[PDB]
Enzyme design. Sequence first.
Site, PDB file in Angstrom:
ATOM      1  N   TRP A 139       0.908  -1.012  -0.100  1.00 17.77           N
ATOM      2  CA  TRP A 139       0.012  -0.135  -0.001  1.00 17.77           C
ATOM      3  C   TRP A 139       0.828   1.281   0.118  1.00 17.77           C
ATOM      4  O   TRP A 139       1.788   1.389   0.850  1.00 17.77           O
ATOM      5  CB  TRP A 139      -0.835  -0.016   1.134  1.00 17.77           C
ATOM      6  CG  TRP A 139      -1.908   1.166   1.433  1.00 17.77           C
ATOM      7  CD1 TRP A 139      -2.742   1.384   0.583  1.00 17.77           C
ATOM      8  CD2 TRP A 139      -1.913   1.813   2.343  1.00 17.77           C
ATOM      9  NE1 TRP A 139      -3.578   2.692   0.882  1.00 17.77           N
ATOM     10  CE2 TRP A 139      -3.112   2.757   2.132  1.00 17.77           C
ATOM     11  CE3 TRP A 139      -1.261   1.996   3.701  1.00 17.77           C
ATOM     12  CZ2 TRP A 139      -3.362   3.793   3.201  1.00 17.77           C
ATOM     13  CZ3 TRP A 139      -1.714   3.033   4.537  1.00 17.77           C
ATOM     14  CH2 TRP A 139      -2.574   3.963   4.401  1.00 17.77           C
ATOM     15  N   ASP A 221      -1.469  -4.710   9.265  1.00 17.68           N
ATOM     16  CA  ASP A 221      -2.218  -3.771   8.707  1.00 17.68           C
ATOM     17  C   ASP A 221      -3.596  -4.533   8.350  1.00 17.68           C
ATOM     18  O   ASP A 221      -3.563  -5.396   7.502  1.00 17.68           O
ATOM     19  CB  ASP A 221      -1.678  -3.034   7.649  1.00 17.68           C
ATOM     20  CG  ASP A 221      -2.898  -2.139   7.088  1.00 17.68           C
ATOM     21  OD1 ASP A 221      -3.861  -1.923   7.140  1.00 17.68           O
ATOM     22  OD2 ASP A 221      -2.154  -1.113   6.283  1.00 17.68           O
ATOM     23  N   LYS A 257     -13.521   0.054   4.908  1.00 11.72           N
ATOM     24  CA  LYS A 257     -14.064  -0.963   3.852  1.00 11.72           C
ATOM     25  C   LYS A 257     -14.970  -1.757   4.554  1.00 11.72           C
ATOM     26  O   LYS A 257     -16.239  -1.927   3.827  1.00 11.72           O
ATOM     27  CB  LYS A 257     -12.872  -1.479   3.304  1.00 11.72           C
TER      28      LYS A 257
HETATM   29  C1  LIG Z   1      -3.581  -2.086   3.250  1.00 14.83           C
HETATM   30  C2  LIG Z   1      -4.324  -0.793   3.793  1.00 14.83           C
HETATM   31  N1  LIG Z   1      -3.683  -0.004   4.800  1.00 14.83           N
HETATM   32  C3  LIG Z   1      -4.501   1.213   5.118  1.00 14.83           C
HETATM   33  C4  LIG Z   1      -5.637   1.663   4.490  1.00 14.83           C
HETATM   34  C5  LIG Z   1      -6.486   2.933   4.918  1.00 14.83           C
HETATM   35  O1  LIG Z   1      -7.487   2.851   5.568  1.00 14.83           O
HETATM   36  P1  LIG Z   1      -8.251   4.185   5.875  1.00 14.83           P
HETATM   37  O2  LIG Z   1      -8.976   5.030   4.940  1.00 14.83           O
HETATM   38  O3  LIG Z   1      -9.284   3.743   7.207  1.00 14.83           O
HETATM   39  O4  LIG Z   1      -7.306   5.161   6.762  1.00 14.83           O
HETATM   40  C6  LIG Z   1      -5.987   0.825   3.283  1.00 14.83           C
HETATM   41  C7  LIG Z   1      -7.562   1.152   2.810  1.00 14.83           C
HETATM   42  O5  LIG Z   1      -8.438   1.150   3.558  1.00 14.83           O
HETATM   43  C8  LIG Z   1      -5.641  -0.200   3.080  1.00 14.83           C
HETATM   44  O6  LIG Z   1      -5.937  -0.831   1.882  1.00 14.83           O
END
Ligand SMILES: Cc1ncc(COP(=O)(O)O)c(C=O)c1O
Lengths: 411, 412
Positions: A139, A221, A257
């Site tokens: 990510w 994560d 999500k």
């Molecule tokens: C692997 C990963 N980490 C972190 C996030 C960040 O999520 P948020 O929008 O809740 O900060 C995302 C997407 O939700 C993601 O795909």
Amino acid sequence: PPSVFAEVPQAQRVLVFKLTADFREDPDPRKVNLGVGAYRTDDCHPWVLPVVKKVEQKIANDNSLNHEYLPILGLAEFRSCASRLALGDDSPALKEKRVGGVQSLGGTGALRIGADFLARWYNGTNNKNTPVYVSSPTWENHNAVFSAAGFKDIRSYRYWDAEKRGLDLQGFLNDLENAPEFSIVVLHACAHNPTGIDPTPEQWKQIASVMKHRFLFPFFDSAYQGFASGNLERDAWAIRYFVSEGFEFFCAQSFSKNFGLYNERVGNLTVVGKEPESILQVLSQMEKIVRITWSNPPAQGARIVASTLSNPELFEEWTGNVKTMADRILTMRSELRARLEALKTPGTWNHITDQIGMFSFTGLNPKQVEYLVNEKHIYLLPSGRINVSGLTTKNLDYVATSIHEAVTKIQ
Amino acid sequence: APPSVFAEVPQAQRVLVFKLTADFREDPDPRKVNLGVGAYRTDDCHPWVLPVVKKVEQKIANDNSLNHEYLPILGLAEFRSCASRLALGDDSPALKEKRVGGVQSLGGTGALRIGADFLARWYNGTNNKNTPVYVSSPTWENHNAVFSAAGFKDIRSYRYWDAEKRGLDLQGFLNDLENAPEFSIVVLHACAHNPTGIDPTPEQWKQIASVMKHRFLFPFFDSAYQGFASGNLERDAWAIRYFVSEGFEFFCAQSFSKNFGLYNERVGNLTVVGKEPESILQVLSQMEKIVRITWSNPPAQGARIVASTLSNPELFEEWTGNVKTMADRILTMRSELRARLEALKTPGTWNHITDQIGMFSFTGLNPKQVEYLVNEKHIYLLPSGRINVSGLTTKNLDYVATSIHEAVTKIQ
Ligand SMILES: Cc1ncc(COP(=O)(O)O)c(C=O)c1O
Ligand SMILES: Cc1ncc(COP(=O)(O)O)c(C=O)c1O
């Protein structure tokens, strides 16, 4: 006298942002956006979960609520519900009171305050040299968040094998085996972003074996629990395995999500330690970090999640909504694979159904992506990543035919 | 077994208000009074959800067209323009000249943090953590911590509270600004100074601006109480708008926690005023990078409430009426407390009680006198003598005034 801002440069553009801007301006009626960063329905629309709509109506009509500051660490029932969701009702870590939870501004906020804590208290005093390992690829924001916390040495472990279109376990294990002791390792709990390929449970046991040997700190994560497969327990298997193996670790949870609550910024940092009393000290240091970042967290999204997770009828309705999204994702993967194979496309395509979650590495190379974008108006990143929920009943034949053309025309 | 990797993590000390409130809670004495709550309370000692907020929350819940997709990184566009327009005024030349940007932030704290992070990276050089940062003496308990977290190594005080005269030490303030190195950052309370309650007058603000202009000092306004402070949005923003007309470039961290009562929805805005439109766009582009690695993008609900209110004339007028209700009650508690202390012939002067504005007041009591109030009379306040004026009520005002009379007369 020039502006004190006169020398401030224009920040680097985000690839995803420009891609969506390009798609928006495209007049071609065949165009498809496979680079959305969120769940979309078969009609290309956002989807507010029915259980979220229902709970929001209850909250709006509850005159007993006020708007006074939450505790620094956040809403107590959200934090306990969130950590229990990740660890399971019967977790020995919960029974032994070795668990803490910090409500955070989505998964990103959880990663940030966890990285801030480690950069100050972990592996010595203010040790910014502790290597931080992220997957190759990962990510986009992982590197940036840990860099922002001060970490000077961000490294990658091998993960995606572009030839096999799958997990390069041998390279992953060898990179961990060479990681300096006490390095931090950022692990995707399930539905790897961006590739979609996860270690199997047997592979996770090999990963945990090296990490235990070299004292590596797991930083999970967990952004897709339940969303990934429709099964909350299965999506938490690796986290709960690391608990039973006796690791101490952090787990950054997102509810963006699996609740569709992207813009309410609902996250939780779950902390698992060996002993209850030092977990309380960790939490007290997390309070200091929160207080100088956002002071205390917002209530609306956490109230929705807490109300849902603590009411058994709402919980079962929620799991139904989550299975609706996971089922659609599963179906688009199966239909894309089937059409690619019906077209006699070169190469193997079982990776499309081996992967899990809303993102898939298609295995296409940058030149093939350029054909899709420029000649077929199908928008995706040069990495070949697609949002599988961008596939629809109406565009599947066009996307599969275009991928077939890209693979057969371009080396 | 080997020790936990957390085994050496020490216990952090909690803020003074937490202990004060637990002590109050555990106190069995039936005369007890909590003057250290950190938010607005009614004459019945309860929180107050503003009527306009209840009405707007109903509108939002019934608007089937709203979704939960990510806001832009910088936040909800209608909130950012409404918030900056609230601080700068509808007819601001900066707004017409496109010299203004706005970043939706996590309350006022979040706005201060993002702005400090930006300054530590791009201002007065690149990655200059040595630029002095000046805060008032005393100041809001988290100003030092927020700028230290951004990396600033030299956080300084300017004289402000004069304990002998119970008022502003304007000469000390001006002398400290005169000796500051050029381009030093100065954190200014836009109105309703926290914790003292005493603000510079407009003519005093002109002297402050003169020194800051001559020494190229960067104003970082903290605007946490606009409208709430005095009941008049225009008057509460006078200092900010004067700095605009004097040609300053500056930041202004706005909080809507108090003036909307939206404490737990974390609604803030960082307003940036610059000399040139196009460098402001580049400032905002760097603010996006900072937001991305802090909270990614901001929450919607509180910003939607504020935006809906500020962009609709009927809701805006209801909101200003609600804000005036809170400001008027605080104003009345100040007048009643002063009048009762003067009726008891309490030694010293007490016009500082009504010269101050906003929720917080430096009473001018010394620590021995506060100790009497806490231990003997069970009136809970900080050793600094700060009280939350909305902690006073028609029911407790005579007990509090009588107790302050005792403390002042019994203890020198
Ligand atoms: C692997 C990963 N980490 C972190 C996030 C960040 O999520 P948020 O929008 O809740 O900060 C995302 C997407 O939700 C993601 O795909
Ligand atoms: C002067 C001052 N600055 C900043 C803040 C922080 O506001 P918030 O709770 O919105 O982060 C406060 C809130 O009262 C304050 O009094």
